[PDB]
Symmetry: D2
Subunit: 486 residues, 4 copies
């Protein structure tokens, strides 16, 4: 037994949930039906760092049926669905390092173990994955920081001091994620100081699932420091305009209904950030009678919010009157402890963005004399000692739809994961320096949509030759120019 | 040892702190109940009243019980559904000695009727702890009221021939059909009580001052009794208060239907053809919520007025038979029975979801589905079962065994609307108690009190109410303080 | 010959609209088909005071095909559709005294003429109508004030001084409508002081269309001054829950679109009054992106607004911030000159209630130093002298959906007018010092709904005997108890 | 050089609406404030072909205040607002050739005159514009076809026979628009065969307002036949995501309420095309209770429609049951004569796309034995002689919001038109061979949004340095990458 999971006996519930889920994941069902025998990913070692849900287990199953060997971990300490994880282990579909309620330390150990492969020749030698499926950039981060650490290690033939200290370049305390990651890097430098650089040779790419992960990729790219090809799956139209928006419209409500006992109707609920995710959040909240107040830094998004009937305000002007706060920025320090101190009694705070630092959870937990009580497994009420007023935080500020619920439903995830399988296949067939972040073709993007039309009984109109020539498109697409915004 | 802890029958007393914490959080929005406790906890208008409740024991209900308790009443409680009890809510009441409780999540139908009977059984410490009944009843669906009346009928039959009437000892009804399990289990209790004391039910009537009924289905049962001249005690209809029916039934379900569906049905609602059978107060809310998350709602209705209302909101109105093969999810919201038959179920597409939000499980023919020759059943997750027909090999997925899905698969309506319903309940209980000092009929609370309920909740939401000038008040012919609408106003 | 309209040449444009409108007015089509042979209203003299729109023409046609003789006028100086009035006169369906943009003086003269019938036996003598169709209660008001005036006239053998003065009580100037009505009453007393009382024996009742008219009836009943039977048509479920709400949802917008050039999306629109009309107005405004703010006196209605996501405030707390103000209360002095002076530049003010005194128009027009410029017909900008700021009034405060637009569409008016025909037939069929106000039975209310199901392709489900017994109703209905609110 | 409009006495009504409109057009108001002294467009001859509405008059005034000489015409025969055209002529800020209800021949004559300028040196000699503001691409089309005509004329020393023929290649009858354009071009070849080619020299560019015009530009570019620089205004975020969507949401409803007497609630309304325009149309229709059914060729757009709860079907499966049909495709022959013959009695047909050929109006009008009645101004009922069934067409299939109503409101037009002015200034500045189509920068696109925030009381949030660096943007924008879809 190499996998490290919660409980293998939950396998059958997972397997059963996978089959029910699969009814609507027609994109993944079709890729399996079309490629299970030809196996286009045969020989590929794939490491995944992505919320291990039932939907994800179907993604993993799909990659496995296309011939890949798979190792997997979750990209969040609270998102793993333990029955989903056990289904993959029992069936020998993948080697898994993930469980619900991981410590930060265990998060980084699991990611590192998922990145570790034993060479098919001899078990003595370690090697890396050929491909990476990433959500948030953590697997991509540990690889680049691993390489940087090794280069610093050789340069002075000793452990770089930045890995043996609790402080950053400016004397401040390092985040728990960096301390735990640096601890893993130091350990690996002593076991093998060419571990990370040795992987670069066999690494053919990474396919990134989400906006926060993409931003990280784009930053590396513009600095000329990206060390492998990358496909941006987030910005496929069938991902960003469906998963991000429609997926959150349902999964935000599910997370809120599970964690927040109150009625949303008539409540002033602040949605911080009105991008693809924020738009979905507001639509769902209004659907159940909430009066949505939006905050934005972008004047275009602000205007869009206003066109849908929502008030647009700065947090300071509403922090004392609003009832519920939802961060959807992908930024950091959007809700501070100071903001929290001004909120009304039993105001709720939740985050749906990828990382928990949108909310100053650290400042809240380390506030002098603060009291905390567990409302439920993942809901905590914090009471400030000076005012005696309390705020209620959902799942310690981690993405609420996956921390307090089961994330987006199968339909949109099938669309997102169909893009993932296609991105992986593209990277694999192109396998062989300035590396780029590219997106999938519009042809494939439309194809993903075509694969899901029958789920919903959608009947598509077909162009005539005359109409096609008139609007200047092929009868079979693509139907829009590259800059079309949908 | 504590009498409340020992006498109560719940699942786990250790969950009490979670219950108490939830109750405190809920109180932020349950301003109606918070105010009644503040205003009356000293003078205790319900002092000495023995109240028996039969209403889903949720956190919201625990605050209701706490309110009756702070007003001076002794209390015993049970839920009105085998799956709706929230064990932490029940534990909270037992640990604080607020009430003697007989309720847990996932009861059997036998246990359900034994808990109700026990909730109706009191002892008088001033009369050598001898058996008696409650003074007041809080009912949701009319089961407390049913056992009382069937209890009186049973005793009247028993007394004629000095023996147990044979309709209690038989597993079949008047038409030779197999009795529902609820009737069998209720008759079993009635038979046992006739042997303990054949003057038990009629003996309670002396001290019973009324029942206050929470929902549409329980009210229907009351009106049927009243029109037949068989209602044995005064009743207050709480469901038809404006601050109950226009809020709990509609806006409560808008949220709680979705929560139940999200927990039981893993699939995305967006784009699905979802049938909502019944477009009354509950259906209106279900529809609004469903389309709020992208579903395409199709309505079935028997009332041409309601059907037209659905159509005005952009919904297709169809007969079930015309969409039973194409629709993805079916939600019954009628309060009727046999709305979705086994025969309808056999025609549904593969993996169609079926759920009910009405009070009783018989809206969907669950019994006929479970007892269909050769049917195959597997438990997907908690209270979610897939049934497979042997002749077609097609499957349908039933949520909560047909039981009201918002309470059985989720936590029911949220605190805010429940406070509005429960403020009406406390007012009704007080009205019946102060009144203690053809024959019996059903009545509703006055509009003054109905408007009062709403006033108590305006600050929760930062609502600012405009005030009429004398000139305006005289012009529209109302008092500055209300009521602001005539009795027939529909809101 | 005896009709007074603007132009009879428009008739053809009215007759075409009537036929098109009849596609959706199935209730009226059905009553015509079913009762035109037997003619249940045969010999009845019907006077109508109801906005003479295309829809009203179909109502009047239906009363005519059913054997009635008819005289009609509009219940508002701006609501008449000239092509509709022409159609009725051209085909000799009714005698009409109505045109768009009447003066208030002519309004009362037109009404008084509509009430004046000639005795079929001896036409040299006057008589009144047998039945009245009323909207707002003006026909009912002139009858009752006329009777009061005649009685007062006899006690002192002279014109009562209240009819000749023009202040009354507080010394405040009397409304133009009362002065013009009193002028007509004075003129009729001098010609025949038994005119009004002479109509009482043969008057079999009035059927009242709207909330404001019903309110006036209820006041008369509580004081024991109601002089004839009345049917409250507004409170049929198929009128109040459809016309008041869904009719306004479309016609308000249409009225706002013709008079207000500005975009509604993003604007803070205050809807004063959240009753059957207010609910519909809000729904329509939200539908095109406006942020609706509600004002209410009734806490129940205020809570309903909150449950639909609308902020509920008092006018004084938003009068300076809001962009548009829509009164829908059926009350008076809701928007005062003092409120208007605090409004922002080019703020729009409109009314959808029956009467124009919801907004203090008289006070605005007669403000010292006020400047007024007509932007277009029925749209005026008023500029205050001190601040130099302006407000824009639609329709001189008259119901904006009928004054600036064509009112509710055919479908809902058919439901309302099907109730009217049924009411007229009930009062005629039934032909005592005390008279009361009653409503149609729920059987007939449900019948109105049944007649319109085929329009929209609605398929109704039918109860089995065991279900009908279980829910305690008859298979053919009624399906709800009398206190059911729908 | 003397204007041709309907009636100059309407001037004050236009000038009055202009000032009221300016309240929301803060983009154009700002450009006037900032650049009226320096006049960056001084000396520039600007010819515009764009619906001459009140909104357009503020655009022309802005262009004038920036120093340009201006001559203008509408891009549709029914969209001109005569009072708007009058205001421009009265204020003498532009030479105008436009009026409501033009003939097709007049349209091309007006456009050709708008393209004709008297040489800055001589009064006898003719020249062309320096810049073109176009909507639909007709100004751009006449120029390119004018050049082709001249080149073909010199090639064989004769009038090209395609200009004289009434049919074209496939034997089908040429559209009236083509026959009229060709007649104008034929005549210009005789007066001066180097007219069009003479213009290319002084033409610095065209700025195209809409999707259909852009498509035409992209086709010419791909073929390497574009003869001047071009700026695609349609695809600025502040145009396509506001004008096309939220503009139509209000203006479609305005057009339908004016042309269609029926209630939209409950009706099955088919929206053909679910792009930027269709999205808005559907939302506005749903908002008034309609049951929207969508037709699409694009599987992504079709899925999006399904995610909003709309049924997605092919026209043939609903053509007999639907009540109202709205084309929003920018394609042609979307609704054929055969489809119209299958529609139910009194079905309504309207188009909101740029050209009238989305619906086969020509075929309908010229159908053998077709009866047609004018229901009202710009609304016609057509009855087929075989079935005796009727269909009702709004403004002869021309864009319904501008034909049956007053187009989009000022707010969105200011956003669209602020982009036009910015583009014209860009083209004019660059004057100091393959031509391409470019779009404005995201800096300017966001700037357009900023200019309109105060209208709606929008409070923008400002990024901190730490936040700015974390998400890798400047504190002052741009805040999104180029491919961001909003
Ligand atoms: N789950 C909850 O929390 C909750 C909340 C409130 C009420 N309820 C229950 O919900 C049920 C409905 O309550 P309501 O207040 O909406 O009652 P209602 O009378 O307002 O609505 C029921 C509707 O069902 C329609 N109907 C009846 N039989 C039908 C059939 N065979 N097909 C189609 N339509 C049919 C009726 O015309 C009616 O409009 C009741 O059982 C009530 O006790 C449950
Ligand atoms: N324009 C139309 O086509 C049309 C259609 C139907 C009714 N009406 C008219 O519209 C008016 C309202 O009709 P309704 O059916 O909605 O009546 P309603 O009683 O249902 O609604 C009126 C609401 O206004 C509120 N109100 C009263 N005074 C107020 C004040 N000073 N400030 C704030 N709120 C106040 C009341 O609480 C009430 O809820 C009446 O005059 C009626 O005749 C017009």
């Amino acid at each position: 037994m190499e996998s490290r999971i919660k409980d293998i006996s939950l396998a059958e519930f997972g397997l059963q949930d996978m089959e029910i889920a699969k009814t609507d994941m027609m994109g993944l069902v079709e890729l399996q039906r079309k490629y299970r025998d030809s196996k286009p990913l045969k020989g590929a070692r794939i490491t995944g760092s992505l919320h291990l849900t039932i939907e994800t287990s179907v993604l993993v199953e799909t990659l496995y049926e296309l011939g890949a060997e798979i190792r997997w971990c979750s990209c969040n300490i609270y998102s793993t669905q333990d029955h989903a994880a056990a289904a993959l282990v029992k069936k020998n579909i993948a080697t898994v390092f993930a469980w619900k309620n991981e410590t930060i330390e265990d998060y980084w150990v699991c990611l590192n173990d998922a990145m570790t492969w034993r060479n098919p020749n001899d078990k003595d030698k370690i090697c890396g994955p050929n491909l990476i499926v990433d959500d948030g950039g953590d697997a991509t981060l540990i690889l680049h920081e691993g390489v940087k650490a090794e280069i610093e290690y050789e340069k002075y033939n000793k452990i770089p001091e930045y890995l043996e200290t609790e402080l950053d370049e400016n004397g401040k305390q390092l985040s728990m994620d960096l301390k735990c990651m640096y601890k893993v890097l130091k350990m690996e430098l002593l076991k093998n100081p060419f571990r990370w650089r040795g992987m670069l040779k066999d690494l053919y790419g990474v396919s990134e699932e989400t906006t926060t992960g993409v931003l990280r990729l784009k930053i590396m790219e513009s600095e000329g420091k990206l060390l492998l090809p990358a496909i941006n799956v987030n910005d496929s139209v069938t991902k960003s305009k469906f998963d991000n928006t429609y997926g959150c419209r349902q999964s935000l409500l599910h997370g809120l209904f599970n964690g927040c006992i109150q009625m949303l109707a008539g409540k002033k609920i602040v949605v911080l950030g009105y991008g693809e995710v924020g738009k979905g959040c507001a639509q769902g909240l209004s659907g159940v009678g909430a009066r949505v107040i939006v905050t934005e830094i972008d004047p275009i998004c602000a205007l869009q919010a206003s066109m849908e009937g929502y008030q647009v305000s700065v947090l300071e002007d509403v922090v004392s009157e609003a009832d519920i706060f939802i961060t959807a920025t992908g930024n950091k320090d959007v809700i501070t402890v100071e903001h929290m101190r001004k909120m009304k009694e039993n105001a709720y705070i939740a985050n749906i963005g990828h990382f928990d630092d949108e909310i100053d959870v650290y400042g809240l937990e380390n506030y002098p004399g603060i009291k905390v009580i567990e409302v439920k497994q993942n809901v905590h009420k914090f009471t400030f000692p000076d005012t005696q007023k309390s705020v209620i935080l959902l799942c310690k500020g981690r993405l609420v739809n996956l921390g307090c619920a089961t994330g987006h439903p199968p339909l949109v995830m099938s669309m997102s994961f169909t893009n993932q399988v296609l991105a992986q296949m593209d990277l694999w067939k192109s396998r062989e320096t300035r590396f780029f972040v590219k997106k999938l073709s519009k042809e494939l993007d439309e194809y993903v949509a075509r694969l899901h039309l029958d789920v919903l009984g959608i009947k598509l109109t077909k162009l005539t030759e005359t109409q096609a020539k008139y609007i200047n498109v092929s009868i079979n697409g693509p139907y829009k120019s590259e800059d079309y915004r949908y």
